[PDB]
Symmetry: D2
Subunit: 317 residues, 4 copies
């Protein structure tokens, strides 16, 4: 068993746990410890009841400083700073840090120092890390040497695969993105800050000063829509683009990217493990060179499963 600890039991941490069990990737990975400065029972409870994904199918309990998913007893810690984490004592192979506060080399080193073999951050974190993984695209680029890695963000993890597929096939010249985020808020469309372009140009440096992004928050549940527009060199038609993407979903990107032409709405992709689901019915091409594609993703669940995918790769290399 690969044994992981989770630092920070927020939304993403909780989902990683839920995902571990539902995906059955329990067989290959046991969570041994969770750490959040937050009261233990608020965790057990919040793990059991989730606003988007239903009651957790497994039986959850929290007595003492011990969380319980099914028959597993997860030791619950309340450390405030990285050094005093008993990673060594627990034999932690990978620490998934989902705190959202920690993210630099030093934080990584601190985790390793505390006894963890490797670290995986649930966000981009400081630039200079031993690696950055958008699973399904560049997991093959992982080494032994690589011990402090970032898993990108849920939005970058959603759109990067598509941008790659499109760039490889048609040569992207420039791109612009609009992200429609789910959640006064409960009536408006709210313009919000977005880091998604920084994330794209970082992963694809050939796109510096060639990509921009805006984003809005709307009062929907759980699922996010990404509205991607790119200029390409090779002339293309809407259905050719769709055929490319559909093929990718059945081939090289099976399980990571999905494709659909069914008449669906956002909530239908709730609890969908894919990093991205391409909506074929929304694909457009203006002239022969401006491609619009709408990509759905469960902004938490997809990412959560990628955390686990990346973890496995890290522990295996």
């Amino acid at each position: 068993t690969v044994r992981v600890a989770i630092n920070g039991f927020g939304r993403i941490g909780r989902n990683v746990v839920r995902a571990l069990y539902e995906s059955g990737r329990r067989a290959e990975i046991t969570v041994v410890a969770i750490n959040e400065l937050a009261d233990a029972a608020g965790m057990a409870h919040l793990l059991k009841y989730d606003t988007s994904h239903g009651r957790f199918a497994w039986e959850v309990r929290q007595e003492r400083d011990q969380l319980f998913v099914g028959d597993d007893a997860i030791r619950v810690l309340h450390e405030r700073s990285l050094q005093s984490l008993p990673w060594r004592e627990l034999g932690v192979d990978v620490v998934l840090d989902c705190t959202g506060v920690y993210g630099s080399r030093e934080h990584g080193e601190a985790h390793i120092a505390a006894g963890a073999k490797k670290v995986l951050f649930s966000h981009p974190g400081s630039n200079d890390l031993d690696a950055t993984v958008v699973y399904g695209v560049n997991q093959d680029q992982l080494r032994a040497e690589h011990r402090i890695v970032s898993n990108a963000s849920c939005t970058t993890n959603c759109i990067i695969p598509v941008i790659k597929l499109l760039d490889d096939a048609y040569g992207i010249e420039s791109g612009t993105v609009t992200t429609i985020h789910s959640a006064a808020a409960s009536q408006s469309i709210i313009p919000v800050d977005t880091k998604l372009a920084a994330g794209i140009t970082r992963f694809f440096p050939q796109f510096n000063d060639r990509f921009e992004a805006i984003a809005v928050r709307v009062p929907t549940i759980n699922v996010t829509a990404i509205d991607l527009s790119v200029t390409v060199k090779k002339p293309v038609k809407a259905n050719e683009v769709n055929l490319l993407l559909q093929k990718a979903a059945q081939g090289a990107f099976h399980g990571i990217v999905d494709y659909t032409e069914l008449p669906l709405v956002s909530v239908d992709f709730n609890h969908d493990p894919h990093s991205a689901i391409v909506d074929g019915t929304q694909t457009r091409v203006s002239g022969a060179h401006l491609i619009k594609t709408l990509v759905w993703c469960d902004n938490e669940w997809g990412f959560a499963n990628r955390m686990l995918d990346t973890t496995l790769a890290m522990a295996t290399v």
Copy 2:
């Protein structure tokens, strides 16, 4: 005073009336008749109360074939055919048809035959009508021979002015749009309140019709989200002239003060959709959301009140029609 009749007292019809009074444009134009298939009080009530806005500031009464807004009398009719409309009897200068059912030439002729000097449709309709007016862009192209005219749609009326401004300044090569609307196809039989729902958009067709130079150069998609009243349009265009985000913003800001005052607005304030509720502008450009990818791919987000803006344009166009 120009006298108008309203055919169809739906959402848009009601707003046109509300707009007439609130805009203060009651001094130039008067509503003499409304023709509806619903009950009469049905109308008075819905005119007084609506969920998009607030209680109508004016006092709304209702008696049988009548309707009262303030001191003004408005003959309420219930005719299922245009032939039998007493437009002649009432001296109607313009009929604003907001039924959403009528829209070809013949329907226009029918209204005129019934005694109306001119007709204005609250939508695109079929192609061959005298002119489609996107007020603030091409109202100067109204001759008096134009008797049956279309007011475009609220979304086309929102984005066309921006597309013109950008094309004039930088030469648009191709474009793509996403419309985020507020609240057959199997998507239609399912809950609005938690989902982003792809819907059919005819915005594409409307743009290329108004700008024929853009055939096979514009596409559009749209989604419906469970927000109130205000619509966001996410426009992306490739241009010839190289540009920077703030140059684009400066252009649009200038237009808002200048040539397009009262039709397009510009803002850099941190606002959300509901802040544009009841805003008379056809379009409000959100400067903070302008982007340029490379030097040639412009993204601009434009807000509009999808009913109020359009409702005021109906009145603006009406005036223009009655004045030429």
Copy 3:
């Protein structure tokens, strides 16, 4: 095997099917035919994708005149009137009529005439059917000679069990209810941002089931823009003096005993959506129980207004097909 046909594949009909499979009651019941005046391709699609309940876990297919949940084939019919239904040909033991249009005796007789042994309506029907079953309360009064029966409504099915429990224990003198539903010049308007009064058939339904409460029960209801789960705010005057926690203890005991699987009890800090897809007819929220003086009880009861009811349809169906002489 008990073999059922479903007349009307609307919201409730679809859920009955989903419920049959998810609850494993499919070992004991078979849906052999569905009839709806709707596009059969659309039937399959709507069965697979639901706004409340998510993607149906089973594999759904449609082709010509067959729907396919899993490896099962259901005959899809399109008859516009009750007379021409091939119930006899298919050996239907019970017809679950979830059309919401049909509900008289005659409609029942028509179904039986068409070849169905018994009929179960997904609503309270007219006033004089053979039985109304609020399962868990009076299913023991089903005899084998009741062939046209009503399953009450989801709201009545939700609150009746609680009213019984309270009446038995303390003697209800009078009652008033407020129902908060999830999503006439009010229907003609924007449901995404308002509390909307709506008419309710609940006071009718209660006094019908408990005739001793005529002119002693009233009800109002509002619609709010939430998802799927309904809250019932019950207020009753009782004879026996009581305290909040006594009432809670009574109800909690019922939930573990006589009403296990039908009524549930909870003290956990939950919100409506947590009862989404809950099979109980009613879940009592202990934390919201109150008693004013010693005689005015307030209790808040949650229910999944569709799922609970759907599973009760199946429960009642079984009882009807089983009830021996």
Copy 4:
């Protein structure tokens, strides 16, 4: 005219200002100072644009140490402590404290010490206070001596008038309330507001018993938050001595609305939804169509209110009474 300063420019503070100008109580009250921790420009923005009330009709300019509503020049302070407030310098007749933090009479004394003649809190207060005015019910009990007074809460200000009317006419024996509110302590608090019905704490049970001490151990209350806009619904249930019918109750309340409680309580039988009462200055609007009576003694009444606007106007009403008495 009467001069007022506003301590705390939150939701309520902002609305008081908006109300002053819109209601037309501007020919009777002037705001001279707003003391607030955030910058003069933040203040001005939020005053102009509101999530729940639209664009403020007046022109909101900003300059120097001044806000401007029309040609009226209001002054902005950022005094962190209470003693350093220049109330004396500005000749403040009443301080409306809408901070929600201050509410003890020491706080009151502090304001007065700083130079304010009288103080009015936008909530119940931490108490041992001079008075508690639910305007339209007991403003006549104000005395030149009461210098530190509380304006109750918006919910108490909404339902108290109705409870009085009902008690006077039929003698309330006991009561229970449900409030339907729009949008570490609880585990419910940090959960998605968009889509669930959310049970929460409520102090209405107290506020009522405090105002009507004859109801100790005779009133209880619960409340839920739903994702609607701005307007609040209060679902009141009371037992009464005198036997009554639904329409008698309605007739009583309707009469009150034109008569003794004109401008404070309103009555309607029109088919309306919550948003229709948005920006309604009444403390309470009674929905006749929802009135019920179970037996002859259990009254259910549903009362709407704009939980901010009504209250804000009452703040102004109470202020006037205080400065006048």
